[PDB]
From a paper:
A recent groundbreaking study discovered the ancient origins of the cGAS-[name] pathway in bacteria, which play a similar role in the immune system to combat bacteriophage infections. Binding of cGG to bacterial [name] causes it to oligomerize into long filaments and activates the nicotinamide adenine dinucleotide (NAD)+ cleavage activity of its fused N-terminal Toll/interleukin-1 receptor (TIR) domain. Depletion of the electron carrier NAD+ eventually leads to bacterial growth arrest or cell death, restricting the replication of invading phages in infected bacteria, a strategy called “abortive infection. In this study, we demonstrated two distinct mechanisms underlying the regulation of bacterial STINGs and a structural basis for cAA recognition and oligomerization.
The crystal structures of bacterial [name] from [name] (RiSTING) in its ligand-free and cGG-bound form were determined to 2.1-Å and 1.46-Å resolution, respectively. Despite the conserved D252 interacting with the N2 atom of the guanine base as previously reported, the bound cGG is sandwiched between the guanidinium group of R235 and aromatic ring of F171 (hereafter “sandwich binding”), in contrast to the four-layer stack interaction with cGG by Prevotella corporis [name] (PcSTING)21. Another conserved arginine residue R233 of RiSTING deviated from the bound cGG and only forms one H-bond with the guanine base in contrast to the R233 of PcSTING, which forms closed hydrogen bonding interactions with the guanine base. This provided a possible explanation for differential binding affinities to cGG by different bacterial STINGs. Superimposition of the protomers between anti-parallel RiSTING with cGG-bound RiSTING demonstrated that the binding of cGG induced large conformational changes in the β-strand lid, α2, and α3 helix. Alignment of the anti-parallel RiSTING dimer with the cGG-bound V-shaped RiSTING dimer revealed a rigid-body rotation of a whole protomer (~70°) plus a dramatic conformational change in the α3 helix (~120°). By contrast, cGG-bound RiSTING formed a linear filament mediated via lateral dimer-dimer interactions without rotation like previously reported linear [name] filaments. In RiSTING filament, the α2 helix and β1-α2 loop from chain A interacted with the α1 helix and α4-α5 loop from chain A′, respectively, forming five hydrogen bonds (I180-Q215, Y303-D209, D301-T208, and R300-T208) and numerous hydrophobic interactions. To avoid this, RiSTING interact with cGG via sandwich-binding mode (R235/Guanine/F171) without additional stack with R233. Despite similar linear filament formation, RiSTING filament is much more flexible than PcSTING/MySTING filament due to smaller dimerization interface and devoid of electrostatic interactions.
Author numbering:
A (entry chain A), B (entry chain A): 4 to 162
Amino acid sequence: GFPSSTLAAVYYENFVKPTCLHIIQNGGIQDDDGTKYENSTIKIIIPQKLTTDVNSQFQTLKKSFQTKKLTFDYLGRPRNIDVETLIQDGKLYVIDFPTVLSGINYAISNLLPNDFNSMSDDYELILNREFDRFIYTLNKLALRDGYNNLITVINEKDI
Amino acid sequence: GFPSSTLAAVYYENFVKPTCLHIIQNGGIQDDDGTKYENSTIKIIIPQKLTTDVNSQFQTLKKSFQTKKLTFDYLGRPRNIDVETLIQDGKLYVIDFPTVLSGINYAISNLLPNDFNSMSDDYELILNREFDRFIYTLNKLALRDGYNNLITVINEKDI
Ligand SMILES: Nc1nc2c(ncn2[C@@H]2O[C@@H]3COP(=O)(O)O[C@H]4[C@@H](O)[C@H](n5cnc6c(=O)[nH]c(N)nc65)O[C@@H]4COP(=O)(O)O[C@H]3[C@H]2O)c(=O)[nH]1
Ligand SMILES: [Ca+2]
Ligand SMILES: [Ca+2]
């Protein structure tokens, strides 16, 4: 249907779902010191602006949240899973800025005059519609699988 | 625009492009024994059928091509890059079955009667249209950046 929905579907199937299954099946995510955090949950961060350099955007968010990388395998997966994590008060949070959101910039290209400015109300509307579709798809798939209470999706503007 | 185009754009920006830049900037990909292969190129494999278990599909293709995993960092990237590789006659091939293609199944859901069979001519047409858009987008972006000669995109049916 909409590109933003399909990007949420691959992000869910190939990242969020196996992360949730690891949390459930492993009894949590393990830190460097060997502590396993049964109470592991996921915060998915939607940025206020979407840049054409999501790698630098990721780095700036990692610095701001003071996260560190942990890694785990999910059986059958082609590659390991890497997560940015914060540990507070006996709880672990995966804090993910999805690199898949770069696809939204590709989509929107055709929807704007190509003299467009990123700060305009028109542009804020079109981007927010794509984010709304992405968020709904992510939540729909998580709810269907029973992982609603493991995942929250937060817009940067609302922090 | 089309979901399949947007999936190609994220696959290109967040995987194919940094792989190409590593090959160019590093003077190739390095094997376990320390041999660096200046002649490193990418074969992107489009499957004949798209399953709802791309992880098992990836494993079956890895077994058939007899590839092994190599890993490298690309400066600024949130995570390392993992590639399946084959080495033959002084040349290295990245052989990638893109897990992003799972998104095409999500897209197509609405386009078929939901009593549909995967083997029908109708279904072969709709899937092939999505693959055609994915391939064109990948090639367009690679050509724009100058990486056309590093990448070939092969349909499994044509091997
Ligand atoms: N934090 C975290 N997020 C993850 C991880 N794996 C997947 N994701 C997230 O899930 C999205 C979809 O991944 P995909 O469908 O496998 O689709 C992927 C996959 O086909 C390919 N790709 C990305 N990284 C690699 C890699 O290291 N090796 C290979 N062979 N392909 C990769 O590029 C596509 C697009 O990737 P993105 O735009 O980055 O979009 C990714 C990213 O936002 C992970 O280990 N950690
Ligand atoms: Ca939730
Ligand atoms: Ca080519």
